[PDB]
């Protein structure tokens, strides 16, 4: 039950694509700005998350959750990150994909019960620490140990010594969790130490995983879909899309001409924003091989010829096969 601020696991790769996101960048009465704290555009959704920030601070988020529906490449992990940033002072953030719960060497209930405990922290001459660390300091995980640490951690707050900072749990690809996983969450979201759960989905009316006749919105059950607050994200304009790319290049230390964003932006409009942003690094390295400081439009047209997006490459192989 020792406190370990230093001992932690951080997925560098997951924060790295959102290193620039510093704050939801809302001001005044929650009014969004065209560009603030790294974010750009998405004014509608950015304003709304500003409200959810308030419901959390004012303790109104009683057993509620958040759902961010929208096409992929629209700033959904970014906003959920910013909400973790906006609650302030290094609140935990645990991004996980829905398809991680299907693992052979560990039960599904452990994979979720784990990711929750990584997202609730305790700032306790003081050092912060997550509930999962107090479990690993507590090689056996038991249902008895859970309530014990919940009493031990909550006896400290109830002593007034301890304050609980609950973080954000981001579950992407929510339509891949089966019923047994949602019913596990459904009781965990009832607890008083739980974090905020922020789901995310780009599918539509999805049948719940399993042989289920039920057709449900976003593949979530009806009983849990009632405690959800839905927020929509919209596709990025070519002009906005460029201003996103310009911010990643600045954060990587990559010098890129204007015409290279004008072209690199349009490929984003075609495939996704995630595809375009990935081409920066491989473009830069090819820019080094030809001994240039900055990425010329020749380098983007070149990388664009070598590497493919999944949505086209597979299209080729099926059709060339046919």
């Amino acid at each position: 039950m020792k406190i370990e601020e230093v001992k932690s696991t951080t997925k560098t790769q997951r924060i790295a694509s959102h290193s620039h996101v510093k704050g939801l960048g809302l001001d005044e009465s929650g009014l969004a700005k065209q560009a603030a704290s790294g974010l750009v555009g998405q004014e509608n959704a950015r304003e709304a998350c500003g409200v959810i920030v308030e419901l959390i601070k004012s303790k109104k988020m009683a057993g509620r959750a958040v759902l961010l529906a929208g096409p992929p490449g629209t700033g959904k992990t970014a906003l959920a990150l910013a909400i973790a940033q906006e609650l302030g002072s290094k609140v935990p953030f645990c991004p996980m994909v829905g398809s991680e719960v299907y693992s052979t060497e560990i039960k599904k209930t452990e994979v979720l019960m784990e990711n929750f405990r990584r997202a609730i922290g305790l700032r306790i001459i003081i050092q912060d620490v997550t509930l999962h660390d107090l479990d690993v300091a507590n090689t056996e995980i038991t249902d008895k140990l859970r309530g014990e640490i919940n009493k031990v951690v909550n006896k400290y707050i109830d002593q007034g010594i301890a304050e609980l900072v609950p973080g954000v749990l981001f579950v992407d690809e929510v339509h891949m969790l089966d019923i047994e996983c949602f019913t596990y969450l459904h009781r965990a979201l009832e607890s008083s130490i739980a974090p905020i759960v922020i789901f995310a989905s780009n599918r539509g009316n999805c049948v719940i995983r399993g042989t289920e006749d039920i057709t449900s919105p976003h593949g979530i059950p009806l009983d849990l879909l009632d405690r959800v607050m839905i927020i929509r994200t919209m596709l990025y304009t070519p002009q906005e899309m460029k201003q996103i790319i310009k911010i990643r290049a600045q954060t990587e230390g990559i010098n890129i001409s204007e015409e290279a964003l004008n072209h690199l932006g349009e490929i984003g409009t075609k495939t996704t924003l995630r595809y375009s942003v990935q081409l920066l690094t491989p473009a830069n390295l090819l820019a080094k091989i030809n001994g240039k400081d900055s990425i010329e439009k020749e380098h983007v047209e070149e990388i664009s010829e070598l590497f493919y997006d999944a949505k086209s490459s597979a299209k080729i192989l099926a059709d060339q096969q046919d």
Binding site: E54, L67, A69, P71, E180, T183, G204, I230
Partner: protein, 288 residues
């Protein structure tokens, strides 16, 4: 009265069912509460628990609650009936955790005989409770078989089941039955039907919840919201309120104005629009 609004049909029908419970003529039946989601199916079940007694046990477990890896389905259902029977008075599953500590099934049958003694003794006295199983079409023929064996018991509670499904495949087989219940049981059920709320009924409901969350509101913002409720869903309107005050009280208005309800309606969507936006994007992406 007591938070009921409208629903006079089911409320009356529920009234009749108490009498067959009071007169001891309910043995070998059940009650099924059929109707659209969130039309007070829970409430009508909660009602009968209250009106039937001062200390009647009550349990609210869903269908999908049984498909968990915590224990068997039978253990989960057995624990339900055991909890919903009261014998101060404390339930039988309450007694099981004392005189046991899982539970050995021997412990159960052990406590059972001892309880038949104290009840027969005339020191201890038994009272049935109410079990409510929401979303009942999730259960399967292996769990329905358990209920018929469970209702046959002498100390059995009253079972009440809810559902929002018409003809459906009986989960666990290849046949279709009304409400996804086996036909051996549907001919013992008293089916009670709840109809969706009217316009005036809706307004009264929100006006009760606002009191519950101390939120001032204009008559225009009250009836603009009720309009939303009938157009989309009652559980949506009730969601917006707390989020609506926080915008109004942001600019320090305090009394919610129609502007805020027009605003917050534009920020958080309901499940209908959520899908249709996804569905539109899906098909235009499938386009070419």
């Amino acid at each position: 009265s007591q938070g009921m609004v409208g629903q006079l049909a089911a409320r009356r029908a529920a009234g009749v069912v108490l009498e067959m419970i009071r007169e001891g003529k309910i043995a070998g039946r059940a009650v099924l509460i059929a109707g659209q989601p969130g039309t007070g199916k829970t409430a009508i079940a909660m009602g009968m628990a209250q009106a039937l007694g001062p200390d009647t046990p009550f349990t609210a477990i869903a269908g999908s609650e049984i498909f968990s890896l915590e224990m068997s389905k039978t253990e989960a259902l057995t624990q339900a009936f055991r909890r919903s029977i009261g014998v101060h008075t404390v339930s039988l599953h309450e007694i099981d955790v004392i005189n046991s500590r899982e539970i050995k099934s021997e412990v159960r049958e052990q406590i059972n005989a001892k309880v038949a003694e104290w009840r027969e003794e005339g020191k201890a006295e038994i009272i049935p409770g109410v079990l409510f199983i929401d979303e009942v079409h999730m259960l399967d023929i292996e769990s329905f078989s358990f209920l018929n064996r469970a209702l046959e018991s002498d100390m059995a509670p009253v079972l009440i089941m809810a559902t929002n499904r018409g003809i459906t495949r009986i989960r666990g087989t290849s046949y279709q039955s009304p409400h996804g219940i086996p036909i051996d049981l549907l001919d013992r059920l008293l089916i009670v039907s709840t109809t969706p709320y009217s316009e005036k009924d809706t307004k009264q409901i929100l006006r009760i919840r606002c009191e519950e969350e101390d939120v001032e509101m204009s008559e225009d913002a009250y009836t603009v919201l009720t309009r939303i409720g009938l157009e989309t869903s009652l559980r949506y309107a009730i969601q917006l309120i707390t989020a609506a005050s926080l915008v109004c009280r942001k600019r320090k208005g305090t009394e919610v104005q129609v502007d805020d309800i027009k605003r917050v309606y534009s920020l958080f969507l309901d499940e209908s629009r959520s899908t249709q936006y996804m569905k539109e994007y899906q098909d235009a992406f499938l386009f070419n």
